[PDB]
Design a protein around this ligand. Sequence first.
Ligand SMILES: [Cl-]
Ligand SMILES: [Cl-]
Ligand SMILES: [Cl-]
Ligand SMILES: [Cl-]
Ligand code: NA
Ligand code: NA
Ligand code: NA
Ligand code: NA
Lengths: 7, 152
Amino acid sequence: XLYAXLX
Amino acid sequence: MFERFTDRARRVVVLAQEEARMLNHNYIGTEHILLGLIHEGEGVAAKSLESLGISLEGVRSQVEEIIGQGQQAPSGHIPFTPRAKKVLELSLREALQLGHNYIGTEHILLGLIREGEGVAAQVLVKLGAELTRVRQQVIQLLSGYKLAAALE
Ligand SMILES: [Cl-]
Ligand SMILES: [Cl-]
Ligand SMILES: [Cl-]
Ligand SMILES: [Cl-]
Ligand code: NA
Ligand code: NA
Ligand code: NA
Ligand code: NA
């Protein structure tokens, strides 16, 4: 969170 | 925040990334969030979209016709578009405004509708699911079997 995937 | 996402809502994000990859797209946009919601298949969001006649293959076809298939499949994580980030932030806002302590597929779709201006929104309208109707279908499921399940 909040970039890509579950990040 | 992803810590508050249900397991199913986390799967939506993972599937959104797979859907972007299969289309050879280098960002996960709202259109891929939409594909992930449908692909997940079992939550409130998937049920609401199916009830309005929206299908996985129809959305995939529209994305290919609107954006175009990309040229090489990306590797690694695929970054969110700015609008997809806004939609995921709005999913948290939608849950908070309803008084909820979790983020489910319902809230991702509510956030997508609330933003209302990207490729997913364009595709939904073109395929016959007005945004206000998508929202209504979601809320009706929340008021029905989801509330029933919580009371039991
Ligand atoms: Cl998080
Ligand atoms: Cl299909
Ligand atoms: Cl959920
Ligand atoms: Cl959109
Ligand atoms: Na949107
Ligand atoms: Na319009
Ligand atoms: Na219609
Ligand atoms: Na209509």
